[PDB]
């Protein structure tokens, strides 16, 4: 039931970095585990990943640098609510 989203304004997209948002009650220990599980499943497929940040305090989840090839895999991880591709913001 987990879904993917990326910016409709195409120039503002930033592929290769993704925000993985986990379900609301997920605990920090679980977020960390889910990121490692991801890196491991990716490595078995020959893909490098980098976990840039683990989110807690507002949303649980993590920020990851990886090929988009891995999105089908990531959406199937336990606890995942949705995944959003990073994108640009600009001073107004």
């Amino acid at each position: 039931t987990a879904t993917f989203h990326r910016c409709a304004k195409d120039p503002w997209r930033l592929p290769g970095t993704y925000v993985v948002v986990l379900k609301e009650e997920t605990h920090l220990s679980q977020s960390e585990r889910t990121a490692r599980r991801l890196q491991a499943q990716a490595a078995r497929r020959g893909y490098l990943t980098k976990i840039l940040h683990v989110f807690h305090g507002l949303l649980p989840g993590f920020l990851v640098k990886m090929s988009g090839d891995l999105l089908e895999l990531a959406l199937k991880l336990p606890h995942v609510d949705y995944i959003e591709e990073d994108s640009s913001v600009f001073a107004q």
């Binding site: 910016c7 409709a8 925000v19 949303l59 959003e84 913001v89 001073a91």
Partner: protein
């Protein structure tokens, strides 16, 4: 000598922010500028993308000065903290902005202070995650003020502008008109909460420690509101976000924007309010606001929902479609709280549900419904609102509907509350009826020849048609 903008936000009768802290998410800032030195703490939090020094801290310094600058600021006292989420070219990321928002919440948990106002002078396209983080940060009790965006476009298409539970600010110029500059200019539409001065706004320049520059933008506009909010929270620290939003609206200049500048369909959706500081004149008052839903879309069973904040009561509910292809609206309960729901007709492009949400403590409000009979129902308590829906394809504390329609009355137990009903009819594109000065419009509906819809605009009830009669319900202590 007073800058046009600081005069504009000054109310017609008048006489800060130090208990309050304002966070700024922006470029780096020149913290030693004499406008702001000693008032701003640079956190040295930084999360910015790589490029692809005077100029680097230009944007941020100006806004820090607008908020708190000693000569040209709105909230001349206030304490500030800055996070760097925009690079030297003024570019950031959604991920970086989240990390910043997250940093603010963590700081707060570790060393709690008073009320927080967060200025987000930045925009990207619609972001599910960014809107969510903002919402969550708002529910934790933090006030967020953001720029509508500078694209002369519907602000709902951008984040954080579109983010639920946030004060979103568009920009007006010295003539109180929406800023438009070629293909760029203020955003507009229903996600904009209000406008504020945002053209030719003088403030601190990072060129030199005592220099000044005029800059323009919805960031500048939002900065005025953060300042106004810092002052409002200093005087009344216990304000909830909803109470604060109702105050910004109530104390705004009304019907001062010429709505011709905006696209035809966005005029009705766009609030005609220019922010201002509260007067010296202020005892309890009835505050209400008009809340437009997202458009329902064209599905045959489509519904649009307009909701109030948790601490507000829905006192009335109307709807509008541009075509007039409409099955009306109803007030229905949901998580023990009433919402405004509107129904699309078969073949309609969609409809808006339009709530009237009010701050009314001690209210016990309920709904009284009657099925098709004309159709009538009363509070057997004061009537604050009539709604009506039908299931067919075509056609004294009392509501009256069409003989084929269901009719719904919003009835409240509110002692100390007086209401009256004012009617007006004519032969007609628009009919109009206003509450008397000092009264608050609680409900607006059309007497049942083919109506497009009805909506409250401030304390004026507007009925739109293709012998039509506008009906306003007005209350006060």
């Amino acid at each position: 000598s007073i800058p046009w903008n600081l005069e504009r936000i000054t109310p017609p009768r008048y006489r800060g922010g130090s208990l309050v802290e304002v966070y700024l998410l922006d470029t780096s800032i020149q913290s030693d500028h004499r406008e702001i030195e000693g008032r701003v703490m640079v956190t040295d939090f930084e999360n910015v993308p790589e490029e692809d020094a005077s100029k680097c801290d230009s944007h941020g310094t100006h806004l820090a000065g607008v908020v708190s600058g000693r000569d040209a600021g709105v909230a001349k006292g206030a304490s500030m903290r800055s996070l760097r989420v925009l690079n030297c070219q003024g570019k950031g990321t959604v991920s970086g902005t989240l990390i910043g928002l997250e940093f603010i919440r963590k700081s707060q948990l570790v060393q709690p202070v008073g009320p927080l106002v967060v200025l987000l002078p930045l925009a990207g396209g619609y972001s599910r995650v960014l809107n969510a983080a903002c919402q969550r940060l708002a529910r934790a009790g933090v006030v967020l003020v953001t720029a509508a965006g500078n694209f002369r476009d519907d602000a709902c298409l951008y984040s954080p502008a579109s983010a639920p539970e946030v004060i979103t600010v568009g920009a007006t110029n010295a003539q109180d008109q929406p800023v438009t500059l070629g293909t760029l200019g203020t955003n507009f539409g229903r996600c904009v909460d209000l406008f504020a001065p945002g053209e030719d706004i003088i403030g601190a320049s990072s060129d030199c420690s005592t220099c000044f520059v005029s800059q323009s933008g919805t960031s500048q506009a939002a900065a005025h509101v953060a300042g106004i909010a810092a002052m409002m929270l200093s005087a009344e620290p216990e304000l909830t976000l909803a109470e604060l939003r109702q105050r910004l609206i109530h104390f705004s200049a009304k019907d001062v924007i010429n709505e011709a500048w905006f696209p035809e369909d966005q005029r009705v959706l766009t609030p005609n309010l220019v922010a201002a500081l509260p007067p010296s004149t202020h005892g309890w008052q009835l505050f209400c606001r008009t809340v437009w839903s997202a458009h329902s879309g064209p599905t045959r069973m489509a519904t649009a929902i307009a909701r109030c904040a948790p601490d507000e009561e829905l006192l009335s509910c109307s709807s509008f479609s541009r075509s007039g292809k409409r099955r009306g609206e109803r007030m229905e309960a949901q998580g023990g709280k009433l919402v405004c729901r509107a129904h699309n007709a078969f073949g309609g492009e969609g409809v808006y549900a339009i709530a009237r949400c009010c701050l009314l403590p001690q209210a016990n409000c309920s709904v009284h419904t009657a099925p098709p009979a004309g159709t009538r129902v009363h509070c057997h308590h004061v009537l604050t609102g009539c709604s009506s829906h039908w299931e067919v394809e075509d056609l004294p504390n009392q509501c009256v509907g069409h003989r084929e329609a269901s009719i719904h009355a919003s009835c409240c137990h509110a002692p100390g509350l007086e209401c009256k009903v004012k009617e007006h009819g004519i032969p007609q594109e628009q009919v109009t009826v206003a509450c008397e000065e000092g009264w608050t419009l609680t409900g607006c509906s059309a007497l049942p020849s083919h109506v497009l819809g009805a909506y409250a605009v401030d304390n004026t009830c507007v009925v739109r048609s293709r012998a039509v009669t506008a009906v306003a319900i007005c209350c006060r202590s």
